[PDB]
Amino acid sequence: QNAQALNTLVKQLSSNFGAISSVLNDILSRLDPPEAEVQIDRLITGRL
Amino acid sequence: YNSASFSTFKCYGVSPTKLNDLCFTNVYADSFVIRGDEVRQIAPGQTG
Amino acid sequence: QFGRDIADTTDAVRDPQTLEILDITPCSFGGVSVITPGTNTSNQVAVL
Numbered sequence: 001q002n003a004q005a006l007n008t009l010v011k012q013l014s015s016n017f018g019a020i021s022s023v024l025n026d027i028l029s030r031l032d033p034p035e036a037e038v039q040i041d042r043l044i045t046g047r048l
Numbered sequence: 049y050n051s052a053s054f055s056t057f058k059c060y061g062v063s064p065t066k067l068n069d070l071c072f073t074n075v076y077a078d079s080f081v082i083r084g085d086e087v088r089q090i091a092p093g094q095t096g
Numbered sequence: 097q098f099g100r101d102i103a104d105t106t107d108a109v110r111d112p113q114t115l116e117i118l119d120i121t122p123c124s125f126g127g128v129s130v131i132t133p134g135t136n137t138s139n140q141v142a143v144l
């Protein structure tokens with residue numbers, strides 16, 4: 001149980017939640033900050 | 049991106065400043081001629 | 097072009113211009129901790 005629990009955590013790092021890509025560096029290095037704001041909002045809510 | 053003699057230059061999904069540092073798989077240039085400001089009519093997901 | 101593992105973890109890469117297999121390892125981290133007797137006894141301190 002314990003192991004399986006945190007395994008799902010790790011798999012949660014590859015889910016979009018609605019952004020344009022699950023990896024943060026892509027959003028940081030492809031969008032101007034006023035829209036990176038929106039994308040990072042979505043990702044942060046999901047992971048929280 | 050700084051030769052602003054064009055009429056409309058709008059990038060979707062990419063911020064113009066951060067274009068100098070990305071290795072794309074491929075690009076497609078699609079060209080045509082249309083009268084009036086039908087640039088607004090041709091919008092992703094929009095109608096017209 | 098490149099390899100990975102369980103999560104979105106680029107665990108290797110094939111390098112352009114040399115065609116070699118480079119492993120990627122995370123840079124070290126880990127939370128510090130401070131061990132101290134009471135300030136009313138001494139201000140000495142050790143760090144783990």
Ligand SMILES: *[C@@H]1O[C@H](CO)[C@@H](O)[C@H](O)[C@H]1NC(C)=O
Pocket residue numbers: 112113
């Ligand atoms: C870059 O140049 C070197 C020799 O100058 C060569 O070994 C290498 O293949 C070249 N890169 C590519 C993608 O061909």
